[model samples]
Target: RLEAQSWARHYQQLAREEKEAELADDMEKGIPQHLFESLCIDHLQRHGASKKSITRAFDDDVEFQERMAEHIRYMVETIAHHQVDIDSE
Candidate 1:
């Protein structure tokens, strides 16, 4: 049990750091949203979410900042719950 808990914590820390690193890389590389979205769409479509998920609430205009934020929160939450590693390196 302790070993499992330790691994969970380790993976959580790794995921947090990776997400930060990704945001930094995006800023550093100036990766346009279109390009990022393209890659994300490819992966998501292959995995679970379809094109419909890509065309979701904020993809069009993000007119509602709150809604967009909620969407982002949900995504991050999903990643955390599933222990999805962002793998920045």
Candidate 2:
């Protein structure tokens, strides 16, 4: 619990700090939302959320968002990484 949360929190800090890039890349449409669902679930699991709990609503889902920052770090980083590494075929 403590171990997972420590990395989760650190990941969130990076996301929050690099949020500027998120707004830009997050706007572009390319990555499939369905594909990312599994990724988010994996991230949430490691970040201390139960699989059953995340599929809920009201405060239940809100907590999911709170924990989602861990996933967003990759979202923020990967989107930019893609363009930067789009070297050519």
Candidate 3:
């Protein structure tokens, strides 16, 4: 008998408005950019992020998506704790 490993599909399901709202809320709530960057990078890497998939995750144009993916990769690579391995879901 074989046991199945836990798995889940990744999705970035927030509306653009919701994303903007959260960003602003983060600022208003005094959430640091670095803190948020860490979280975003972790989420992206954990989900086996790719440019194609990330583009579909938001309503952004190619340039924006590419930039975001690059930024996430940079953040993940730079961090000491390297948060991409945790399964939060």
Candidate 4:
């Protein structure tokens, strides 16, 4: 074989990447940056994102410094989305 392919490698990475891009689209549409990133980060984790990668985004040495300072992003991101069935009413 000229090259090898792994299904999980493709599937899982694709899942996370597409999810982030979805979040990116959400960001463009006026979703709170904090809300989007928190969901996006956990989505990254749930979808197998690397810890260091997530950390770099969250911590002092960040890649995307959009809304808050690093500390506040940490604060807000910690309180991520939860069951808000009440809001649906």
Better of 2 and 3 by lDDT: 2
C-alpha lDDT score of every prediction, in listed order = 0.60, 0.59, 0.45, 0.52
Error of 3 at 86 (Å): 17
Q: Write the per-residue lDDT of candidate 4 for residues 24-48, one digit (tens) a residue.
A: 4444445445564576676888777
Descending-TM-score candidate ranking: 1, 2, 4, 3
Q: Give a tens-digit lDDT track for model 2, residues 3-52.
A: 99999999976775466465546643444444456665778888887766
Per-residue accuracy of model 3 over 1-87 as CA lDDT, tens digit each: 122222211123234334544444434334333454455556786678764454454444566556665665554343412232232
Identify the leading candidate in terms of TM-score: 1
Write the number of the candidate with greater TM-score, choosing between 1 and 2: 1
Q: Which is better, 2 or 3, measured by TM-score?
A: 2
Q: In candidate 1, what are the lDDT values of residues 1-89, reduced to their tens digit? A: 99999999999888786775555544433433455567767788778887877767337756643554555555545554444344433
**TM-score against native, each model:** 0.33, 0.31, 0.26, 0.28
Q: Any runs in candidate 2 off by more than 4 Å, and if so which?
A: 1-24, 27-52, 57-61, 87-89
Clashing pairs in model 4?
none
| Candidate 4 lDDT score at position 60 | 40
Candidate 3 global TM-score? 0.26
Candidate 4 vs. true structure, TM-score:
0.28
